[PDB]
């Protein structure tokens, strides 16, 4: 018949459907060989994947217990740092190895390539006492090949997860892959090689920490306050990583753990370098890792009302005491070190003592304002990107400024309720505001807590001669600072 | 090719799932269901089809494709990491979880498609029903009444005829009377009339145009009616979070 569309036509769709994710606020860069270099991986899950002995479970157990005074982090991430030279690898997330490789006793063929094909002879696994035997038998058949990578290649099997891993003989350079063949007796599906998403790792050099963190942030950057947490790093490595962190203005935090004596050696290298935190350890004691306190406090925050919080007065019963003298605390505070201090209050004796970061005059010294600026930048960027993705076009006229301001309004409304905008008493700041903004009486407004402007100018980009427009906005707001000292006098009569 | 007419259910193994979702990415109206290897057939691709077929569009019929139990079908995934890997490929399955000793239900009601298309299956079904009902009412109007004049009486009569369908849509649950600024700006831009977003309090906004044109087949001028409908889709809660502060 003639289709009905000749007479009635209806088109269905979803408007403003473009979803833009929301930024989350810890990531650990370990060195163990379980994690492939090119990936980034909600406590029991960590226990299952890594095992009870690993330091990763040790960290996650203490990380996942936290109350934040407003009743938890609820996520963690791991990435891989290539400490030393590595051989090419091929690495199986699906549950397998139910001891049902039977039926592959009929002359199995598998194909692997360094740069040209290598076919493997008949592999029979009918006996298959265990998957360890299966890996050994695969290794025996692979080692018969005359290619230098495959001459001493190793095949291993992991029980905690369900991964088969193949490692080439040579160290430093090489590329390996596995191909899906058309033969019936091909075990690239019983193995998880060449199916779905398989990580093929090429050979690498010794590599460097600041390059490793950049590679990790390339794949996903939904985190805050990363840390390495392996063996202690050299001072130069800490300097390089702190410089790299300072390269991005107000994105991440970087927590370091030091001894008391080493603290003075630092704060000379890492002076400036906004976004770096130093935490003092206790020598000749349990590990009771402490560099995670700012990271935990940041992770637990939910940006609900009254969420500004304060990093100073907070208690950590797990961590052990660090300093107990006033003169020692005075010496430590010169280096901007964060610690757990103990003080007597009518018999009872311990809390985190300083919430300060190393940085310049222009950067945020306190950690609470640092976190709030991270959240503001992420929220504004999300709203603007979502606007760009949904609406058809944004005209460069008065309607454009009106629409942009209307869209940014809810974020600024929520910012007042959160506590990042304080509606607070200087003359110097008044003059600075009147100079930076041509409009006077902006400082009186910043009564309400903020002042916003939109520009919408035009320009020509360098890449193409064409004129492309652009929007420039300026935001001023009063930061959220908490009282830290109380003084008074009680006059009687 | 047809926008929002049919659904297409496919059954795959776990390993083959990653191979797909590269070919069939986009392609609105396609559903992927994971099978169990080395087990009974216990065909599973029929779950969305059965749920759609049983619906009767009576009050409270919007329903939700997520939380529903299939005792006939066998379990598919049982680890959180495996479920995390599977969800990246938009696969639908039966998951098992412990709730104080007792152990199984369909887990995701998502379809593969683009940003403009309906990812959830419930809104997909409701849009199918809306299109069919509107087309039926308009065709019936054309077939019964003698003529539809291209004047104010025309818009009034067309709106009056479409009114009962939209009345039933509110009772069904396909119209929700729901909280964004971006959506507000989009609505104010798409429709020249501002304060439409405040109206969409009631759940919908409808317009009629009645313009004229000349068709290509014959030189003659033939008229036509253009209508625009905006309504708030029906979305169901899927996650619960809270904090219990004591003292």
Numbering used by the authors:
A (entry chain D): 1 to 25, 27 to 42, 45, 47 to 75, 77 to 96, 98 to 309, 311 to 356, 358 to 431, ...
B (entry chain M): 253 to 309, 311 to 356, 358 to 431, 433 to 434, 436 to 456, 458 to 504
From the paper:
We determined cryo-EM reconstructions of the extended and contracted E217 sheath at 3.1 Å resolution (FSC = 0.143). Alkalization or spontaneous contraction during purification, observed for ~20% of all virions at neutral pH, triggers tail contraction. This results in sheath compression, with the pitch decreasing to 265 Å and the outer diameter increasing to 250 Å, while the rise and twist decrease to 22.1 Å and 30°, respectively. A secondary structure superimposition of the E217 sheath protein in the extended versus contracted conformations revealed that the N-terminal arms undergo significant movement, with an 80° rotation around residue 24 upon contraction and a maximum displacement of up to 20 Å. Sheath contraction results in a dramatic quaternary structure reorganization with a ~17° clockwise rotation of the β-sheet and extension of the β-strand #4 that becomes nearly straight C-terminal of Gly14. This results in striking compaction and contraction of the sheath that expands in diameter, exposing ~500 Å of the naked tail tube. Upon contraction, tail sheath bodies come into contact laterally, forming a much tighter lattice that releases a large amount of energy. Because of the increased diameter in the contracted state, sheath subunits do not make direct bonds with the tail tube, whose only point of contact is with the gateway C-terminal extension. Sheath subunits make extensive lateral contacts in the contracted state, providing the energetic contribution that makes this conformation thermodynamically stable.
Bacteriophage E217 infects Pseudomonas aeruginosa and is part of an experimental phage cocktail developed to eradicate P. aeruginosa infections in Galleria mellonella (wax moth) larvae and vertebrate models. E217 is a PB1-like Myoviridae of the Pbunavirus genus characterized by a ~66.2 kbp genome, significantly smaller than the classical enterobacteria phage T4 (~169 kbp). Here, we describe the structure of the whole E217 virion before and after DNA ejection at 3.1 Å and 4.5 Å resolution, respectively, determined using cryogenic electron microscopy (cryo-EM). We identify and build de novo structures for 19 unique E217 gene products, resolve the tail genome-ejection machine in both extended and contracted states, and decipher the complete architecture of the baseplate formed by 66 polypeptide chains.
